[PDB]
Structures are given as C-alpha cells and as structure tokens.
C-alpha cells in the first residue's frame, strides 16, 4: 500500500489539474498493477477486477464510472509524456514501430502483439523506470518472459546482461560475475538489465548473495583486498566524471552504493511451481518483498489465434471453393462470421493446442505421467506446418510441371509419327497411335488426381504437422486418439483431407524406410512413426527407451558422419560438446535425467552472427558454430520426470512398449506369419498412398527418357508399344486396387478382429511377466525373452504341422 501511494504520487506529480475521474482512474490503474498483477488463475483475477469497481463506486458515487474506469485501463509516458493515459491502439502502433526498429537492431525473430504481451511490456516498463525497481516473472516457459524483458530493457536503453550457467559452476564464478556487473553498473554509470533464469537459481549458495544484494542494495564483502582497491580507484574516476569529488573511502563507497541502486534492475524468470516457489520464499524473502511479482502463464485463445494468423500469412491457404460449415467448430469467440479458409485453419490449429491441453489434463487425472505443454510447442508446430506445406506444394508443382513436359513431348511425338505415316508397318503405326492416345487419356486422369491431391494438401499437412510436433511422448493408443480427434475436428470444419491418411507413408518414402530397416530398427509401427519424428525436427529430439535400440539405430544412421557417444555424468561432457559444436558432427547424448543446464543455448538455437563468425555461448566461453550439427539427447529410464524448461525445448520420442504398442506388434506378426495373403493385401493398401503412384511416375519418366531417343528409329519394328503396354497393365492393376480398396479394408478389419484376442493375450502375458519382479527379485524377464517364446510358438511348433 505504500508503493500504491508512491505510484499515485508519481503519476500525480507532473500533472496540475485533474478531475475526480482522472484520480479514480489512476487509483484503479495502480490497483490493477499491484494486486491483480500477482494473481495466478482467472477466477480470482475476475474477482479482483470486479471488486475494484465495487469499492470505487461504493466509496465514490456521483461520478461517471465509464470514464472513471475503462476496461482497457492503461497508462504510459511513451505517447507524449507526463504518464498520460493512452488508448490500446495508439500504443500498439508505437510498439510495432519500436519493435520493427528492434528487429533491425537485434532479435530478428518476429513477435506477435496481442493484448497480453502489450500489457506485460507496459508493466515491465513501469517497473524499470523506478529506483531499485527489481522484477520477478512467474510464467510458463516460452510465454515470453526473457524476450519481453530484453525488448523492454533495450527500448529503455537498459543494457541487458544475463549469466550463463553450467556444471561445476562454483560460487566464485558467480562472485566474479557480480563483481563485473557491479563495476559496469555503478562505476561507469551504465544501466544494466540483470536477467536470471531458474537453472542457476536452483543452488541456494548464490541465492543468499542475491538476497543481500536485493535487500541492502549491494552485497557487503564481494570486493575485498586488491579488488577492493581497484574498485576504489575506479570509483574515484567515476566521481570525477560526475564532478562530485570525494576522497574518503566510505563516502565514495556509499556513493557507489547509490549509483548501483539507481542503475541496476534485476529481472528473474521462474518457471511456476508451488513447491519450488515455496522453497524460494523459504530461502529468500526479497524475491517477494523487494521484488515485484508479475504473472503470465499460458497464452489465451486470442493470443494463440493471433500468433497463428500472423505466422500463417506467407503460405497461400486461399481456397475460394471453401464453404462455411453449419455449426462451425469454434474455440475462438471472435472468429469472423463467415470465415474464409485461413481463419478456419488457424482456428483448427488453436483447437489442436487446446485439445492437447485437455488430453494432458485428462491423463494427469487418470494418474499417469504428463509432460508440460508450452507455447514454444505451438510455435514449433506452426513452423512444421509451414515447412511441410511448402515442401509438399513444391513437390506437387514439380510433379505437375513434369507431367506437362511429358504431355508436350507426347504431342510432339504424335505429330512426328503422323508425319512419318504421311509418306504391315501401317498397322503397327496405327496401333502405336491408338496406344499413345490411351496413354494421353491416362495423363489427363493423373492430372485430375493431381488436382485432387492439391485440394487435400492443406488438411493433410495440418494433421501431419500436428502429429509430428505435438505428440511423440504419448503411447500409440494416445497418439491414435489425438489423431482421430484432430481428424474429426477437421471433418467438422469441412477441411479437405484424406480420410484414410497414414502418417508413416505421407511423411517419408521407400528408400528412407529401407535405410532405417538396414540399421537396427524393428518394423514396428511405433518405431516407424518415431523414426519419422527423428528425421524431421526443429527442436533437438529427446529419446526415451528402456530397450536401448534407439542408441544403436541412431549410431548406425549417423556413423558415416563420425557421430560419437557422451553421457552427462562424465567429466568429458563439456569437451565433447565443444568438439561437436565446433567441428560439425552429431553428438548422441545419454542419461539426460542428470541434465546439465549448459545445453540451454544449444537447445534455444540462439546464435550471434557478428564479425564474420557465428558464435554460440557455452557458459562463459564463446564457441564458434558449425551448420552440420545435430544433437540428440537420450535416456534409458522411462519413468523419469523432466523439468518443464527442458520439456519446452525438445521434442519427445518415446520407445517404451505399452499394452497397445505390444498388442499391435503381436497382431502384425500374427498376420505376417499366419495369413500372408492378408498381410500382402494390407501392405498393398498401405503402399497405395503414393508408393504405387511414385513407381508409376518413375516408370513413365523412364518411358519419356526412352522416347527422347527417337530420331526416326522409334519405328524399328513400328511397335515400341511394349513398354507402354507394361505401363498400361501396371496402371490397370493400381486402378483395380484403388477401386476395390473398400472390400480390402473390410476383409483386413475382419481378419484383424478375428486375430485380436491372441494379441491381447500376448500383451497381458508379457506385462504379467514384466510385473513378476515385485514378487521376487529373481523373477526378471525381458521383452526379447517374450519374443523368443512368441517365435517358438509361431514357428518351430510341432503341433501346427
């Protein structure tokens, strides 16, 4: 309340004539900025918001409450001066201009200006423009804590300075860092933004010195001995610069203290955690008394919608034939009515984010293990969406161009064969002409199919990106549930996507799968999907596996690129890192549960491109970076819980076998070893989604290449039509497969349903054997053991003969 009075007085000082409405407005603004700032959930936020007006109206009647309080309450001195209240849109335009200037200055990554981000920027700016204006941020990782703090510090001229933590980060290094920052702040009168994360705050040794620095205004005893004398010598120079000649050591020392208090703002960024925050309060009271609290957690639906809208400007997604569905599935209440395709797709993306929130909450309620979901995952998902959309559209356009070139070549060859007919040979020429015309009709049909795929591409890409980016940590059953929910939502919005889309086929091709199978990769569907995830990633993947097949597979895959092994526990970890980041080779890393926060710059992908050299800052040492560097983090323990900061910087690849994954594996093995015809029909059904199409395209490309060598010699026997008869029979086969796909899926479903109980029994038996360890330490069994029994049952069984 004394800070309330201080803020009101500061607001009132430049102004000389105010109606009661302005005074009540300033009072309400300070109430918003002091009380509701530290609130966490939404219910108490609305409670405080309504009780402010309740109190204001009850204690101040006869005043127009419309002007006295406006719902978008905002105060700043950026527009004009004297802390005049400003409207949302004018300050939005100003911050857009200043953030553009920032873009040209640093941090080229774009930012999206919703209401929450602008409110946080205003709050941080208000806190900075205050003596001893220390600040603490509590909000989910990736909500925009460090980014906004840096932006506001730069806009104020406050030079940012953050400490990089690593292993064996002794207290002496932190003391030296404080000595440096104090010298830069107080002695040279350079304002410093001192931004600390939670990784280096975990140790309580630094927290006591930080406590004293926050409370007293400066820690006693950080400078002692010769360094104390150097501080005195430089403080004499500082006092000389200010024309405040002082000689006695204590006098200039307290002047240095005043300079530090006036020219040092500390910003803390803590990941919200009730027990962690309670521990922080236990070890230090200054983080809640001398430090003002700002809370902002998950982005609101409006923020997510606007971020998606701005990040989805570049790709086309204009579909003029799109019709607004009746009962549009809407998670954003301000969605335009009627919406076009782009609004629908961005709303669908927001729905995907929200439904993964819901799925994680439901799984937590069930009692399972949950990984935190952050807006960084949303940004990675939108990046995956853009990348996959661009790649698939480019591939389809190239294929269409190739088809057009082939059609023109065929036209030229028909004209040439007509000219050669102008002059039993004539019968063969007529047969060739008829065959070429039939092939032309096949070309037109393939063009129609290409247009259909161009229609489908948007929804197919959305689902593919949503699966590859968000999911991965959950089991096969949960992944299928999420994919089905997303498909159902897209069906509600009439977004064109293939109903029988297969994730494995759409996001790869034949040769990549063959290469993976060449290495130690089982043909399990979960393994294929997670290999898909391993191939495409923006954040460096985190691999969990109780079996260890992952390490061998990824070692074999990158063996040609001199990949090497390193764990966290060894003392060679840092040097192996530096080697990997400087010489440009992949570095598989194991035992991630003992995570080293030194990887934070690596995972963040925050590089500095200055002076003809890219630099990545590992600890206190600047290291050059090589573009051909991919890092993979691995662990054997599957039930370990990760801090959400790491959870928001890596994508999860899960290899733990579950009651649904093992059931599917056993069922597939039963189909393969018991009904080979059903298995091969299922494989043909799976390969129909492009692989047959790709083989047909390659074969017709070979036909075009052979036809390029014509020179009149194409009429050697006047029947080169044997190759095109091969193409025609292949096309007839694939057309028959497409036509009868319904009976094929029906019979596959029936056979799979018939064979399901054996797979369920296999899963139950294996999990009982795994759980036999609790009865006695002796009863230990592996998955390979159960597979050995499984093979001894399926094959080399005398009874089945």
């Amino acid at each position: 309340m004394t800070r309330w009075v201080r803020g009101i007085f500061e607001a009132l000082r430049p102004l000389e004539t105010l109606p009661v409405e302005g005074l009540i407005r300033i009072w309400a603004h300070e109430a918003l900025r002091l009380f509701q700032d530290r609130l966490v959930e939404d219910e108490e936020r609305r409670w405080t918001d309504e009780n402010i007006d309740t109190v204001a109206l009850k204690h101040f009647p006869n005043i127009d409450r419309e002007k006295a309080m406006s719902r978008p309450i905002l105060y700043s001195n950026w527009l004009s001066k004297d802390y005049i209240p400003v409207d949302q849109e004018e300050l939005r335009d100003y911050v857009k201009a200043r953030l553009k200037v920032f873009y040209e200055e640093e941090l080229d990554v774009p930012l999206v200006l919703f209401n929450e981000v602008l409110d946080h920027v205003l709050r941080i700016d208000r806190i900075f423009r205050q003596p001893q204006g220390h600040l603490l941020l509590i909000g989910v990782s990736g909500a925009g804590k460090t980014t906004l703090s840096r932006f506001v510090a730069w806009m104020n001229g406050l030079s940012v300075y953050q400490i990089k933590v690593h292993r064996k980060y002794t207290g002496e290094d932190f003391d030296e860092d404080l000595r440096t920052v104090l010298r830069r702040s107080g002695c040279k009168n350079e304002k410093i933004a001192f931004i600390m994360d939670e990784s280096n705050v975990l140790d309580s040794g630094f927290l006591e010195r930080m406590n004293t620095l926050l409370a007293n205004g400066e820690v006693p005893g950080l400078f002692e001995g010769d360094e104390y004398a150097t501080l005195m010598t430089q403080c004499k120079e500082g006092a000389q610069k200010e024309g405040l000649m002082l000689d006695s050591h204590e006098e200039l020392y307290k002047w240095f203290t005043s300079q530090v208090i006036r020219n040092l703002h500390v910003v803390f960024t803590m990941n919200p955690s009730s027990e962690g925050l309670k521990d922080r309060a236990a070890t230090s009271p200054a983080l809640f008394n001398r430090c003002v609290l700002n809370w902002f957690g998950d982005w609101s639906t409006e923020a997510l919608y606007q971020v998606g809208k701005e990040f989805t400007s570049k790709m086309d997604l204009e579909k003029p034939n799109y019709i607004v569905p009746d009962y549009m599935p809407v998670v954003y209440d301000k969605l335009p009515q009627p919406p076009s395709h782009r609004e629908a797709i961005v709303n669908s993306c927001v729905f995907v984010h929200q439904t993964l929130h819901q799925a994680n909450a439901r799984l937590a309620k069930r009692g399972g293990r949950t990984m935190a979901i952050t807006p960084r995952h949303y940004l990675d998902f939108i990046n995956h969406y853009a990348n996959l959309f661009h790649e698939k559209r480019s591939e389809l356009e190239e294929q269409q161009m190739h088809l057009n070139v082939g059609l023109r070549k065929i036209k030229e060859t028909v004209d040439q064969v007509e000219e050669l007919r102008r002059d039993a040979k004539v019968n063969r020429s007529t047969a060739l002409l008829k065959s070429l015309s039939a092939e032309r009709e096949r070309w037109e049909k393939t063009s129609e199919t290409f247009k259909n795929q161009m229609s489908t591409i948007a929804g197919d890409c959305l689902l593919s990106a949503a699966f590859i980016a968000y999911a991965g940590y959950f089991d096969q059953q949960m992944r299928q549930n999420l994919f089905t929910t997303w498909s159902h939502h897209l069906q509600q919005a009439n977004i064109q996507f293939r109903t029988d889309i297969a994730r494995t086929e759409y996001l790869s091709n034949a040769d990549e799968r063959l290469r993976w199978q060449a290495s130690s990769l089982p043909a399990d569907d979960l393994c294929t999907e997670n290999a898909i995830m391993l191939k495409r990633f923006n954040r460096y993947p985190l691999i969990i596996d109780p079996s260890g097949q992952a390490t061998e597979f990824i070692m074999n895959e990158y063996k040609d690129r001199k990949i090497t092994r390193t764990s966290f526990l060894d003392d060679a970890f840092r040097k192996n890192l530096e080697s990997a980041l400087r010489f440009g080779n992949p570095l598989l890393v194991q035992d991630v549960e003992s995570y080293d926060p030194v990887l934070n710059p690596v995972l963040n992908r925050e590089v500095r491109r200055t002076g003809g050299r890219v630099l990545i800052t590992l600890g206190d040492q600047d290291i050059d970076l090589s573009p051909s560097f991919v890092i993979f983090l691995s662990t054997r323990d599957p039930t370990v819980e990760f801090p959400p900061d790491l959870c928001s910087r890596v994508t999860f690849v899960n290899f733990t076998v579950t009651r649904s994954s093992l059931q599917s594996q056993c069922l597939n093995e039963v189909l393969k070893a018991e009904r080979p015809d059903v298995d091969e029909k299922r494989s043909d059904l799976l390969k129909l989604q492009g692989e047959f199409q790709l083989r047909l395209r390659q074969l017709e490309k070979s036909l075009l290449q052979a036809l390029n060598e014509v020179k009149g010699r194409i009429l050697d026997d006047d029947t080169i039509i044997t190759t095109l008869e091969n193409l025609k029979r292949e096309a007839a086969e694939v057309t028959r497969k497409v036509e009868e796909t319904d009976i094929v899926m029906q019979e596959v479903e029936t056979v799979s349903q018939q064979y399901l109980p054996l797979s369920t029994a296999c899963s139950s038996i294996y999990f009982t054997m795994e759980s036999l360890k609790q009865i006695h330490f002796l009863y230990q069994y592996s998955l390979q053991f159960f597979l050995d029994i499984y093979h001894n049952v399926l094959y080399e069984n005398p009874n089945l003969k």
Binding site: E104, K562, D571, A572, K575, E578, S579, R582, F583, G584, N585, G611, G612, R613, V614, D624, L625, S626, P627
Partner: protein, 223 residues
C-alpha cells in the same frame, strides 16, 4: 511527352544506380545499402501510375527487388570468413575475372546471385567452417602462449608446482580436439600447423606425465 518524362526519370534512376554501384565493395555498408535501396523504393513508388505502367520502369523495379532479396546474400558475403581463398574459389566456379583491390558491388550485382544461390551458400558454409578451425587455432595459440605454471614455495627449500589436475584436463581437451581435427574435411587447410600443435601437445603430455611422477617421488623421499 509522358514517354519523354518517364525516359528522363528512368535515366535519373539509372544514374543513381550507377553512382552507388561505383562504391568499392570494401567500403560498402550493407545496412546503409539496404537503406538506400528502400529510399529508391520510396522514390520509385512516388511516380504516377501512368509512368509506373511502363515496361522499363517495371524492369528496373524488379531488378531492385532482386537486389533487396539478395541484400541478405550480400550481408552474408560481406563477412570476414571469406578470406581470399574462398573468393578465388568462387571466382573459379563462376568463371568471372575481377580484381580484389578494384572490386566493387557493380560486377557482383551483374552476376546473378539468385541463379547461383546454391554455390554461394556452399562457399559461405565452407568459409564458416574454415574460419571456425582457424579461430580454434588462434584460441589454442593464445591460451598456450599465456599459460603459466602455478609455482608455490615448499618449506623455503624449493618452489614446487601444483594445479596438475586442471593442466592435465586442459591438455587432454586440446589433444582430443586436435585429434578430432583430422576428420571434418575442411581439415585439408592448415595441416602443418595442426600437426605441429599436436606434436608439441604430445611432448607436453609426456614431459609433464614424467614430471608429476618425479615430483611425487622426490617429495616423498625428501620427507
């Protein structure tokens, strides 16, 4: 007439283009170049639509648009990692004959950077790798030309040496790094320097491994 006026405006724009293309590439500032390009954009957009519909104006506008979209190509090229071996190599690939001392932005702007983006990016990545290796060599040179033994008195009878662990870790790190230098095919540059550093580091390793044993045995027997 209108054609004469648009021809005069085109001549003025071409003269400005020539004028700032006369700036040598050594003295060209990428940020100021981008600002000048944006200023020309504003000047061209100030022309009336009747003058803007002319084919020559559209050609110059799209040429400048190519210039801005390759401005980031120029920024990457305007580094210090290019050295001159990479520049000579890209001379050889692009089959263009220029003078390093007389190099200006005009000739490189005549060469289609957009058509040769793959080659330019490959050369840039090669330059970054070679600069990284040379920077590590500079770092190891500065840390081994400044490293000092942590001498300390011992019973006022001698001045022994401590800090064996940190020195051993440093030497092991450097020798592992120099052994890893043999891969990463960018190693085909600066070979004799790497071999000399590896040899001297192995000499340091052997000498100090013998030295620590001598020291411990001597102090034990002295006691």
């Amino acid at each position: 007439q209108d054609l004469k006026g648009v021809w005069s405006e085109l001549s003025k724009v071409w003269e400005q283009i020539d004028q700032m293309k006369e700036q040598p590439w050594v003295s060209v500032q990428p940020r100021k170049l981008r600002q000048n390009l944006d200023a020309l954009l504003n000047q061209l957009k100030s022309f009336p639509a009747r003058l803007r519909q002319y084919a020559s104006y559209e050609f110059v506008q799209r040429l400048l648009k190519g210039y801005m979209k390759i401005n980031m190509l120029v920024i990457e090229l305007k580094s210090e990692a290019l050295k001159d071996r990479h520049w000579k190599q890209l001379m050889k690939r692009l089959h263009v004959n220029w003078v390093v001392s007389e190099l200006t932005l005009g000739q490189i702007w005549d060469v289609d950077l957009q058509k040769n983006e793959a080659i330019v990016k490959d050369v840039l990545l090669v330059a970054q790798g070679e600069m990284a290796l040379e920077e590590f060599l500079k770092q190891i040179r500065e840390v081994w030309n400044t490293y000092e033994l942590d001498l300390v008195n011992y019973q006022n009878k001698c001045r022994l040496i401590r800090g064996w662990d940190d020195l051993f870790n440093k030497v092991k790190e450097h020798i592992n790094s120099v052994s890893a230098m043999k891969l990463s095919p960018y190693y085909k540059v600066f070979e004799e320097d790497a071999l000399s550093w590896e040899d001297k580091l192995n000499r340091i390793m052997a000498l100090f491994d013998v030295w620590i044993d001598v020291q411990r045995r001597w102090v034990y027997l002295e006691g």
